[PDB]
C-alpha cells in the first residue's frame, strides 16, 4: 500500500497548538518547520514527480485579537494555484522511498515576482498537499495527500510572540 507519513509530526504539533504562522515576503521565505515525508508502497522501478501546493482551509480570513486568532473578515480572491515541483523530480520510486522527501527550498511569497515561489494571502489559513505523479503514464495517475498537522496562517510578520520564540528555539 502507498503510505506517505509526516516526519517531525510532533514538532509541527507544537506550532499547530499555538496556531502556526508562516512569513510571506516580496522575494519569498523558506518554511520552518520544513515539510518532510517518508514514502513506502511506490513501485521502486517506476519514475515519479513530487508536487506541493497549499489549499485554502476557510471561506474567511483570520486576525489576531487579544492573543487569539478569530475570524477576521471576508476572504480575498483565491491566490493563483501555484505548484512546486520537488527538485529531485523525476526520480525512481526507490529514490523517493530510501530517505525522507524534504521540501526545504519552497519559498512563500505575497508577490508574483518569479522563481517558482508559492503566492499566499496574508491572514488566510493554508494546508500543504503533496501530489505523486507517475512519469510516462497514459492515465496521468496522480495521488494527493494533505497534512493537517502542517496547517498555518500566512503572515507578513508574526502575530503570536510564542510562535516567534518557538521558531527560534527549534531552528
Ligand atoms: C532540529 C531538527 O532538525 N529537528 C527537530 C525535530 C524535532 C523536534 N522536536 C521538538 C519538539 N517536539 C517535542 C519533538 C520534535 C525538534 C527538532
Curated annotation (Swiss-Prot):
Provide the leader sequence positions: none
Q: In which tissues is it expressed?
A: Detected in testis, but not in other, normal tissues. Detected in lung tumors (at protein level).
State the superkingdom. Answer: Eukaryota
The residues that make up the annotated DNA-binding region are: 11-171
Q: Where in the cell is it found?
A: Nucleus
Disease with which this protein is associated in UniProt: Neural tube defects: Congenital malformations of the central nervous system and adjacent structures related to defective neural tube closure during the first trimester of pregnancy. Failure of neural tube closure can occur at any level of the embryonic axis. Common NTD forms include anencephaly, myelomeningocele and spina bifida, which result from the failure of fusion in the cranial and spinal region of the neural tube. NTDs have a multifactorial etiology encompassing both genetic and environmental components.
> What's the stated role of this polypeptide?
Involved in the transcriptional regulation of genes required for mesoderm formation and differentiation. Binds to a palindromic T site 5'-TTCACACCTAGGTGTGAA-3' DNA sequence and activates gene transcription when bound to such a site.
Give the quaternary structure.
Monomer.
Give the protein's recorded name. T-box transcription factor T
- Origin organism is Homo sapiens (Human)
Q: Which residues of the full protein are shown?
A: 41 to 211 of 435
Amino acid at each position: 500500500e502507498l503510505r506517505v507519513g509526516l516526519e517531525e509530526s510532533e514538532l509541527w504539533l507544537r506550532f499547530k497548538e499555538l496556531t502556526n504562522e508562516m512569513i510571506v515576503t516580496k522575494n519569498g521565505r523558506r518554511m520552518f518547520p520544513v515539510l518532510k515525508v517518508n514514502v513506502s508502497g511506490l513501485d521502486p522501478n517506476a519514475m515519479y514527480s513530487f508536487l506541493l501546493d497549499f489549499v485554502a482551509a476557510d471561506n474567511h480570513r483570520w486576525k489576531y485579537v487579544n492573543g487569539e486568532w478569530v475570524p477576521g473578515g471576508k476572504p480575498e480572491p483565491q491566490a493563483p494555484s501555484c505548484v512546486y515541483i520537488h527538485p529531485d523530480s523525476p526520480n525512481f520510486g526507490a529514490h523517493w522511498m530510501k530517505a525522507p522527501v524534504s521540501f526545504s527550498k519552497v519559498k512563500l511569497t505575497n508577490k508574483l515576482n518569479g522563481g517558482g515561489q508559492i503566492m499566499l494571502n496574508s491572514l488566510h489559513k493554508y494546508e500543504p498537499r503533496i501530489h505523486i505523479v507517475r512519469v510516462g503514464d497514459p492515465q496521468r495517475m496522480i495521488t494527493s495527500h494533505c497534512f493537517p498537522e502542517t496547517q498555518f496562517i500566512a503572515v507578513t510578520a508574526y502575530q503570536n510572540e510564542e510562535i516567534t520564540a518557538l521558531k527560534i528555539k527549534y531552528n
